[PDB]
Point group: C3
């Protein structure tokens, strides 16, 4: 379960980073 957790967490970190980049672009009016 722990190694199952590590994978879910790593999957979340990737998605949260993509979301942060998207939201920054929208907040800043980039492009």
């Amino acid at each position: 379960e722990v190694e199952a957790l590590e994978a879910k967490v790593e999957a979340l970190e990737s998605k949260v980073q993509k979301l942060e980049k998207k939201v920054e672009a929208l907040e800043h009016g980039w492009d």
Copy 2:
């Protein structure tokens, strides 16, 4: 603590999925 973690992670997956849907709508101009 592990079963405490599993719950926090599952709570995060739900919120991250809602955020992804919201950001896609905003990025795409849906509706």
Copy 3:
């Protein structure tokens, strides 16, 4: 690894909450 996980999860909760606040502002047209 478990205490490593707890930290990553807590870091994620903080970022997900900031993202939720940002997206709500954008969705609502706040300010």
